[PDB]
């Protein structure tokens, strides 16, 4: 007729809550998850007495603090969306392929395979957000469920919907940080406004959206200045541990040999499908969502391309 439950937001700190059987959990407490089940619209009964619940809204001040410290500044629906995802993707299998883990195709999740396999190549990145960092470590140790559900929640991904690998990869990488230093110095100039430098540091210096080759990235770019005249930009210095370049699907013929400068790339095939590729030992290792395959030549549409560390200084006075 009345029960006691433990309520948490972090799996560490629980508060005791007393409930009766005269309204639903949602009326008395909030949106609650009991071992992955949304029992919010249930009338509490004996079989939940003593059990631990995850709360997703109507937090105490102390819980709101732990939420922000653990997950970051998230929107109200976050915890709800995360709990749902965590449960929905529990059944996803991480298949071992050529000694590398890959995400088996289920529910249009092919884009997540490209994302996770690409992240696994990125040397020495950590996530600022503790919950995400713990999940990532847990993922590298063989349990990928929390990490998959977390990046899906932060990325506003919907279970079962097809999505874009480049989109999520950059959205996830926006929440990371490097162990070393990284620098990118853009030199900008206009004949009216004058000359200024724009520096990007750390993770913002390793990722770029809009070109897919280093030659195009390092090129003089011309656009319209805020004064309406002609403005120019050019990388004048670039030091990074790796470089991820992303563009729209680009039909290309990848061959070995000659040795490409890039160590991996992602491909789109067109709902659409995503394949992760690595260059290892003079071959292209195609990872098709739990599947491997090897070829020396591939005509594919590349999207993201991953390069090794950059050590670049211009030996040109780019302004003249």
Binding residues for Zn(2+): 190, 193, 225, 227
190 binds Zn ion (CB under 5 A): yes
CB closer to Zn ion, 198 vs 227: 227
319 binds Zn ion (CB under 5 A): no
Q: Which of 38, 146, 164, 288 is catalytic?
A: 288
Residue 288 a catalytic site member? yes
β-pairing verdict for 2-8 and 52-55: parallel
Segment interacting with Zn ion (CB under 5 A) among 144-152, 193-201, 211-219, 237-245: 193-201
Residue pair 189/231 in contact (Cβ under 8 Å)? The answer is yes
Residue 110 a catalytic site member? yes
> In angstroms, rounded to a whole number, what is the distance separating the alpha carbons of residues 195 and 205?
21
Cβ 193 to Zn ion, closest distance in Å? Answer: 3
Q: Take residue 14 and report the two structure tokens written for it.
A: 């629980």
Cβ 224 to Zn ion, closest distance in Å? Answer: 9
Residues 6+ apart with CB under 8 A from 228: none
CB closer to Zn ion, 124 vs 223: 223
225 binds Zn ion (CB under 5 A): yes
> In angstroms, rounded to a whole number, what is the distance separating the alpha carbons of residues 151 and 157?
8
Q: DSSP code of 199?
A: E
Q: Which of 110, 157, 206, 207 is catalytic?
A: 110
Q: Exactly one of 11, 36, 210, 229 binds Zn ion (CB under 5 A); which one?
A: 229
Residue 131-160 contact track with Zn ion, rule CB under 5 A, x = bound: ------------------------------
Segment interacting with Zn ion (CB under 5 A) among 30-38, 60-68, 125-133, 225-233: 225-233
- Give the N- to C-terminal CA distance of the chain in Å, as an integer: 83
> In angstroms, rounded to a whole number, what is the distance separating the alpha carbons of residues 83 and 37?
9
Segment interacting with Zn ion (CB under 5 A) among 5-13, 167-175, 222-230, 282-290: 222-230
Residues 6+ apart with CB under 8 A from 66: 9, 10, 13
The three-state secondary structure class of 307 is: strand
Cβ 217 to Zn ion, closest distance in Å? Answer: 23
Number of residues engaging Zn ion in binding (CB under 5 A) = 6
232 binds Zn ion (CB under 5 A): no
Q: Exactly one of 192, 199, 316, 319 binds Zn ion (CB under 5 A); which one?
A: 192
224 binds Zn ion (CB under 5 A): no
Backbone torsions φ then ψ of 90, nearest 5 degrees: -60, -25
Residue pair 252/312 in contact (Cβ under 8 Å)? The answer is no
User: What burial class does residue 135 get, using C-beta atoms within 10 Å of its C-beta: 0-12 exposed, 13-18 middle, 19+ buried?
Assistant: buried
CB closer to Zn ion, 34 vs 186: 186
> In angstroms, rounded to a whole number, what is the distance separating the alpha carbons of residues 39 and 27?
12
Cβ 222 to Zn ion, closest distance in Å? Answer: 12
193 binds Zn ion (CB under 5 A): yes
Residue pair 203/240 in contact (Cβ under 8 Å)? The answer is no
Catalytic positions, please? 110, 273, 288
Given the rule CB under 5 A, which residues bind Zn ion? 190, 192-193, 225, 227, 229
């Amino acid at each position: 007729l009345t029960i006691e439950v433990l309520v948490t937001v972090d799996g560490v700190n629980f508060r005791t809550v007393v409930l009766n059987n005269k309204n639903t959990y949602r009326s008395q407490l909030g949106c609650v998850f009991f071992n992955g089940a949304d029992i919010s619209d249930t009338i509490p009964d004996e079989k939940q007495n003593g059990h631990s619940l995850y709360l997703a809204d109507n937090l105490t001040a102390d819980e709101t603090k732990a939420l922000k410290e653990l997950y970051g500044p998230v929107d109200p629906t976050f915890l709800h969306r995360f709990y749902s995802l965590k449960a929905a993707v529990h059944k996803w299998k991480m298949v071992v392929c050529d000694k590398v883990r890959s995400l088996k195709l289920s529910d249009n999740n092919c884009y997540l395979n490209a994302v996770i396999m690409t992240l696994d190549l990125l040397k020495d990145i950590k996530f600022v957000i503790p919950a995400l960092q713990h999940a990532f470590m847990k993922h590298k140790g063989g349990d990928s469920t929390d990490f998959i559900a977390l990046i899906m929640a932060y990325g506003n991904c919907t279970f079962g919907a097809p999505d874009d690998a480049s989109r999520l990869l950059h959205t996830v990488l926006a929440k990371a940080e490097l162990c070393c230093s990284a620098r990118m110095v853009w030199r900008e100039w206009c004949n009216v406004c004058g000359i200024k430098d724009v520096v990007l540091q750390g993770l913002k210096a390793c990722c770029y959206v809009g070109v897919q080759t280093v030659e195009d990235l390092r090129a003089r770019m011309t656009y319209v200045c805020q004064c309406g005249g002609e403005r120019h930009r050019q990388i004048v210095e670039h030091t990074t541990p790796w470089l991820l370049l992303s563009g729209t699907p680009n039909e290309k013929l990848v061959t070995t040999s000659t040795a490409p400068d890039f160590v991996a790339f992602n491909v789109f095939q067109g709902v659409g499908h995503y394949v992760h590729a690595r260059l290892k030992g003079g071959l292209i290792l195609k990872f098709d969502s739990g599947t491997v395959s090897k070829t020396s030549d591939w005509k594919c549409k590349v999207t993201d391309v991953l390069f090794p560390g950059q050590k670049y200084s211009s030996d040109c006075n780019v302004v003249r």
